[PDB]
Design a protein around this ligand. Structure first.
Ligand SMILES: Nc1ncnc2c1ncn2[C@@H]1O[C@H](CSCC[C@H](N)C(=O)O)[C@@H](O)[C@H]1O
Ligand SMILES: NC(=O)c1cccnc1
Length: 259
């Protein structure tokens, strides 16, 4: 081991656990909820207020979540979700069929439906997404071909939340990650990434997963220095509960692939 290996994810990552610990979106102002609320506002600002639209968006390291895709789905016609953990894909798929024993995302869904103008209702927001999500593929950011042999058109947007820091055991592995992800996008295409800053781990209940503790300095470096212009970059100091993670806040950026 050392830094959580690929198949520690295959074997110890519990989708349902994860969701409960991070995504229950309680009415009590928990660190996990403050952070979630912010990822939300940002994703709204990016996909509904800015000029981030397109035909195709690949969401990388989706894991078992969809919150990151509630706004994007008012901007893209085709949404391909991906993850390295087959059992996370299984949990997402549960939600896409809208099965009764799927995690309940409506507090979240609700939160978004306001941000956006309360124009549409939960039910209609959820349907809209289900129809966007066209495929659910296996992926690996540490491979020059993250979706393997699967044929997809050059994407307009690659997006990733709380993934690259987790999958990348070191800096070089990260920058290659970024480069490999760049191979899925057309030039002038958008890279949206949201991760934790200076995070060395995070806990899913009892089990602990590694994490490359990156500064804003190094992240910006490895992105410019990996083929992208940065449209904006935001840092929030707000962290996860100490029991949860050792992060120092979280960044999010929007980057353009050089032509
Ligand atoms: N090499 C790799 N390639 C792709 N995904 C990986 C990976 N290593 C770990 N992962 C995925 O990293 C994710 C980190 S948790 C984040 C899940 C989701 N993107 C969210 O915003 O909450 C998990 O889904 C795990 O399956
Ligand atoms: N960046 C991380 O270490 C992280 C935090 C929360 C969930 N998943 C990954």
């Amino acid at each position: 081991s050392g830094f959580t290996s690929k198949d520690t994810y295959l074997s110890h990552f519990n989708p349902r656990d994860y969701l409960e610990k991070y995504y229950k979106f309680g009415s009590r102002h928990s660190a996990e909820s403050q952070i979630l609320k912010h990822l939300l506002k940002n994703l709204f600002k990016i996909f509904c207020l800015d000029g981030v639209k397109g035909d195709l968006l690949i969401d990388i390291g989706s894991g078992p979540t969809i919150y990151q895709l509630l706004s994007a789905c008012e901007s893209f016609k085709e949404i391909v979700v991906t993850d390295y953990s087959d059992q996370n894909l299984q949990e997402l798929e549960k939600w896409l069929k809208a099965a009764p024993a799927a995690f309940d995302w409506s507090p979240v869904v609700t939160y978004v439906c306001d941000l956006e103008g309360n124009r549409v209702k939960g039910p209609e927001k959820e349907e809209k997404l289900r129809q966007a999500v066209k495929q659910v593929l296996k992926c690996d950011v540490t491979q020059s071909q993250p979706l393997g042999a699967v044929p997809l058109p050059p994407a307009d947007c690659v997006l990733s939340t709380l993934c690259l820091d987790a999958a990348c055991p070191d800096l070089p592995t990260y920058c290659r990650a970024l480069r490999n992800l760049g191979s899925l996008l057309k030039p002038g295409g958008f890279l949206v990434i949201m991760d934790a800053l200076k995070s060395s781990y995070y806990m899913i209940g009892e089990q602990k997963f590694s994490s490359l503790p990156l500064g804003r300095e190094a992240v910006e470096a490895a992105v410019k220095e990996a083929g992208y212009t940065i449209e904006w970059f935001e840092v929030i100091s707000q962290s996860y509960s100490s029991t949860m993670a050792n992060n120092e806040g979280l960044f999010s950026l929007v980057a353009r692939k050089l032509s």
